[PDB]
Amino acid sequence: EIRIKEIKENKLIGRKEIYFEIYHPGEPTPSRKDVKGKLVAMLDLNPETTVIQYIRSYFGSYISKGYAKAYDSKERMLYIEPEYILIRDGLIE
Amino acid sequence: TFKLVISDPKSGIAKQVEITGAETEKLIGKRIGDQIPAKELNINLNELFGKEFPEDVKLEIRGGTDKDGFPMRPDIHGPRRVRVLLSKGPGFRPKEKGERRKKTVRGNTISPEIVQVNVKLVY
């Protein structure tokens, strides 16, 4: 289960910032791909234009914070976003 | 036994020859910029370069390098070695603007210790 607090649009970059919380009481930490496929469903985003950087689960906490970015075109990430979070997300080999 | 680099300005081609024997004594004591007629130099220049040379061809001594590699400088009288703080002139390349390096160079006069000499052709 993932529930959102922050949905903020940066129009100078034309990009959407999503701060969300994952409820994982008693089960191992969810992976990048699972939440990546989870948010895109009810936020209705293009998977390739959407990237996640960090998902921090605190000590002794079942609710973990996470931040994702949602771009519009295939060149915005190649220009602005750094090269790591394409590789970590598999967008670049 | 000198290596004489004879350069033709018109053709822009230079050829190396060897001077040995008493011919060597003809070059001892000369300076830089000194002119000398071709005839007594005894080199078959017309036959090396493959082009006719009138009999009034002269050679001017300008440059060269020493046995170790020390070049020539017209500015310094005599043939001796003198360490000089080099701002400009032969035998020194400044890289950083304003550099002055102290280099040891051979004087203008031709000495037996020289192994490479440079001359330029005139007609």
Binding site: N10, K11, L12, I13, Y79, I80, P82 | -
Partner: protein, 242 residues
């Protein structure tokens, strides 16, 4: 010891007028020389990256500034160390968002959002009067800009007088003089970020500047250096002043 000018500034020694985490990192961007003084302005990168939060990293703030989207008093400035001082108007027309930099009560700079109608007026205090050959008078403003006028109109200007300055095309609009009763906003001192009206002008000899006694909206009387007093209106402020 040091031999020539320096291009570095530790984060710790940054001016106290900045809202910056001092122990976040070792280094901070050195402000290049510009319109204002060091105590009066901030690098634009810290505005973009921290105050607005559009860019998380300095690199993307630099990229956006290179795109030139941000307008500084109606002039694109792609440099990422430009100093933006007091009462400078930062306008981003893509959002239509316009702010004025003003001192806090604590003495740090803060962005007051303003409407569009206020985005083309900048008030400049006349720092000094001089005049150049050809008998052309020149006025040096508090923000380090200079304007030329002719000799005839010289009596319409004096040092410390405020001028409403149409910065988009460099047109003088109005001249607010320095006289008793004028509405005044403080820029420095313990009375910073205050607004009141002038009461008395205390001339001081022996190199000591003049002290102006300012009464607040509620009648509280305090004193402040003449240089620190910025006139903003004849009786009521002509700009939205926190």
């Amino acid at each position: 010891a040091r031999k020539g000018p320096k291009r570095h500034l530790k984060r710790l020694a940054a001016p106290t007028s900045w809202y910056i985490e001092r122990k976040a990192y070792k280094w901070a961007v050195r402000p290049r020389p510009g319109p204002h003084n060091m105590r009066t302005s901030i690098p634009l990168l810290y505005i973009v990256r921290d105050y607005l939060g559009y860019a998380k990293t300095a690199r993307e703030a630099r990229k956006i500034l290179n795109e030139g989207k941000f307008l500084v008093d109606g002039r694109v400035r792609k440099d990422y160390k430009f100093p933006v001082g007091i009462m400078d108007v930062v306008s981003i027309p893509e959002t239509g968002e316009h702010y004025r930099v003003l001192p806090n009560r604590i003495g740090k700079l803060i962005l007051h959002p303003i409407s569009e109608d206020e985005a083309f007026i900048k008030p400049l205090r006349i720092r000094n009067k001089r005049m150049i050959k050809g008998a052309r008078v020149q006025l040096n403003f508090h923000d380090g800009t200079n304007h030329i006028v002719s000799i005839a109109e010289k009596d319409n200007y004096f040092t410390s007088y405020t001028v409403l300055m149409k910065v988009p095309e460099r047109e003088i609009l109005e001249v607010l003089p320095f006289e008793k009763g004028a509405y005044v906003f403080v820029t420095q001192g313990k009375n910073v970020a205050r607004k009141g009206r002038i009461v008395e002008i205390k001339r001081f000899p022996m190199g000591w500047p003049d002290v102006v006694t300012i009464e607040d909206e509620e009648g509280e009387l305090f004193d402040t250096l003449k240089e620190y007093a910025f006139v903003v209106g004849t009786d009521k402020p002509k700009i939205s002043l926190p």
